[PDB]
Write an enzyme that holds these catalytic residues in place. Structure first.
Site, PDB file in Angstrom:
ATOM      1  N   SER A 178       0.866  -1.205   0.000  1.00 50.10           N
ATOM      2  CA  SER A 178       0.000   0.000   0.000  1.00 50.10           C
ATOM      3  C   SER A 178       0.896   1.247   0.000  1.00 50.10           C
ATOM      4  O   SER A 178       1.833   1.328  -0.818  1.00 50.10           O
ATOM      5  CB  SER A 178      -0.949  -0.050   1.183  1.00 50.10           C
ATOM      6  N   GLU A 267      -7.358  -1.671  -4.625  1.00 50.97           N
ATOM      7  CA  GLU A 267      -6.574  -2.735  -5.304  1.00 50.97           C
ATOM      8  C   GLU A 267      -6.630  -2.472  -6.811  1.00 50.97           C
ATOM      9  O   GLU A 267      -5.583  -2.622  -7.487  1.00 50.97           O
ATOM     10  CB  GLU A 267      -7.078  -4.130  -4.933  1.00 50.97           C
ATOM     11  N   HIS A 298      -5.686 -13.902  -0.494  1.00 49.85           N
ATOM     12  CA  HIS A 298      -5.969 -12.448  -0.571  1.00 49.85           C
ATOM     13  C   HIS A 298      -5.307 -11.716   0.600  1.00 49.85           C
ATOM     14  O   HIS A 298      -4.860 -12.375   1.572  1.00 49.85           O
ATOM     15  CB  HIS A 298      -7.482 -12.224  -0.678  1.00 49.85           C
TER      16      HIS A 298
END
Length: 589
Positions: A178, A267, A298
């Site tokens: 991120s 995402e 995930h």
């Protein structure tokens, strides 16, 4: 999709955009505190205390010049040989947290097995704690009750501490997920000599492109309520151009670079930015390793997976030896659960894409998984054959079981979507197509006369014939499955007999006195006394029929129906003969 998310943001939808990165609030474990004194640090900079959660996981509390209001926690995972080689120096691998980083602990160690992964490796893993929305940057000004000079803290204060205090060589790999992924690239472009490797896992590698800023603001908005203006200033300024990976990629020439994305809104944005980033790198002539592959795992487990995918490239960039790297690969998700026995051994590779799903190599065999079938580890000669065929690429599909034992205790088999593989020490490993398998079943598989397959289903007169111990199984030109066994089978396979009968129309049927099987153009009859002999459909058969066939006066055939003169056809029985000479039936006993 890409446009829809940017759109939602432009329409003032932020609520929930960053929730997928929120980690569990876990407090680090208590430990023995030491007070390391490091000589040669900059003014204001010292290590308040080092708390040892474990002998290999130490938490630094640092007094920052750049961020003095309160201290900064930084987790170290110490190399395998920390104690065993106490004069050795190690390289640094920086793991930067995502947008919703909490003050209590690095998300990496809360949500992943990175502690376990690096345990066997000779590298210092640096995991800076807290800094929600910081993007690990020097903010233009304070905002939201915080003042972020993270880029300075990291490059100018922490880096020396580790170099002086923590047996580090200058060799560094900077990575993160991120905002950490963004930060990893930004920071590398600002200090290109401090790093030999750069890694972005699901990061935002484009900050300047139209609509990107409105998102990065929406991100800081949701992730604690921060203002992007406070961070890099006016939405076009020299600070945004300075912190835009896709623009700056040209400054990373010579470095190992790893970019991953895929595994909703943010995402999607990350996938676009990462794509744009790789595109601009190729243009700049800067080689990048891309991972946009799909995965059954995930978020956190996925990110740790990408870490292990990158590590071999990290190790290369940092010049770590083979003996330094330990076990590079690590099972995840469904394959990990199925390999828990330990049966498969030490993994030789990670999950890699095969047609319908994923396969993973091990010492003792290979594992296979698809969302439909689930995960199963296959070993030895069955697995050796399944591979020879192309694994799930072959017509068999995915395994539906592990290696199973037959009740006679000499057989092993694995079930698949579209068949099975059976093995014995003496027959070998052979695949039976699902339909042929059900036919073989009607006779009770290995428990019946036919026993185990001894070869593969092969082309047979526009059909399939697979050999077995006890006979053969067939796929007919009209796509049916029947088997042929024992003495009838020996006959059916004899030179020129198929020419006369064609494919079976049914399996062997036990009758008073022996057995018979039906074929397209005739029948084979067998008894102890007479043997297996061919009769064709026609006048002779109908006549023999009128007299109760083998149950009646004539009994079983004792010779094959053979041709004589122009149309002449005879066949001996136990108690008589039937001909059809010159068009007429001649019933002679």
């Amino acid at each position: 999709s890409s446009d829809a998310v940017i759109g939602s943001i432009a329409q003032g939808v932020t609520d929930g955009l960053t929730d997928y990165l929120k980690p569990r609030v876990e407090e680090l474990p208590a430990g023995e505190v030491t007070y390391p004194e490091i000589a040669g640090l900059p003014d204001g900079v010292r290590v308040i205390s080092a708390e040892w959660a474990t002998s290999k996981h130490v938490i630094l509390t640092i007094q920052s010049a750049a961020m003095p209001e309160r201290p900064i926690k930084v987790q170290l995972l110490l190399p395998r040989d920390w104690y065993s080689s106490p004069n050795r120096e190690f390289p640094e691998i920086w793991a930067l947290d995502g947008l919703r980083a909490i003050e209590e602990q690095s998300g990496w160690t809360i949500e992943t097995n990175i502690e376990q992964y690096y345990a066997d490796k000779n590298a210092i893993v640096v995991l800076p704690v807290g800094g929600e929305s910081s993007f690990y940057s020097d903010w233009e000004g304070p905002n939201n009750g915080k003042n972020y000079q993270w880029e300075t803290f990291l490059t100018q204060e922490l880096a020396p501490i580790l170099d002086k205090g923590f047996r580090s060589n200058t060799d560094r790999a900077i990575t993160g997920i991120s905002m950490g992924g963004t930060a990893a690239v930004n920071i590398a472009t600002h200090h290109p000599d401090m790093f030999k490797f750069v890694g972005s896992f699901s990061g935002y590698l484009d900050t300047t492109s139209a609509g990107m800023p409105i998102a990065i603001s929406a991100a800081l908005a949701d992730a604690g309520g921060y203002d992007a203006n406070a961070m890099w200033g006016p939405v076009g300024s020299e600070r945004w151009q300075e912190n835009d990976p896709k623009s700056n990629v040209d400054k990373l020439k010579g470095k190992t670079i790893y970019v991953s994305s895929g595994n909703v809104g943010l995402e999607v944005i990350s996938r676009m930015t990462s794509q744009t980033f790789v595109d601009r790198a190729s243009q700049a002539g800067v080689e990048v390793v891309a991972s946009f592959r799909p995965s059954g795992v995930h978020s956190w487990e996925y990110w740790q997976f990408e870490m292990t995918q990158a590590f071999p490239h990290i190790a290369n960039a940092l010049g770590m030896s083979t003996e330094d790297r330990g076990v590079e690969c690590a099972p995840v998700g469904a394959i990990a659960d199925a390999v828990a026995d330990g049966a498969m051994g030490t993994c030789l590779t990670n999950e890699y894409d095969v047609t319908g799903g994923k396969a993973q190599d091990f010492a003792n065999g290979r594992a296979y998984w698809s969302a439909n079938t689930g995960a199963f580890g296959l070993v030895g000669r069955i697995n050796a054959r399944y591979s020879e065929l192309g694994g799930p690429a072959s017509w068999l599909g995915y395994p539906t079981s592990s290696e199973l034992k037959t009740p006679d205790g000499r057989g092993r088999f694995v079930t698949f979507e579209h068949g099975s593989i059976y093995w014995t020490a003496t027959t070998g490993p052979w695949e039976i197509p699902g339909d042929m398998l059900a036919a073989w079943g009607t006779q009770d598989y290995e428990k019946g006369s036919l026993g185990y397959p001894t070869g593969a289903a092969v082309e047979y007169n526009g059909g399939l014939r697979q050999q077995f111990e006890g006979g053969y199984v067939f796929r007919t030109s009209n796509n049916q499955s029947y088997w042929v066994r024992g003495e009838i089978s020996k006959k059916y396979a004899e030179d020129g007999i198929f020419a006369q009968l064609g494919f079976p129309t049914g399996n062997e049927k036990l009758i008073n006195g022996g057995a018979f099987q039906e074929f397209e153009k005739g029948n084979i009859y067998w008894s102890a006394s007479t043997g297996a002999h061919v009769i064709l459909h026609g006048d002779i058969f109908d006549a023999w029929g009128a007299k109760g066939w083998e149950q009646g006066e004539y009994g079983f055939p004792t010779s094959d129906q053979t041709a004589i003169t122009a149309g002449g056809q005879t066949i001996d029985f136990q108690n008589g003969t039937i001909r059809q000479v010159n068009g007429r039936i001649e019933e002679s006993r």
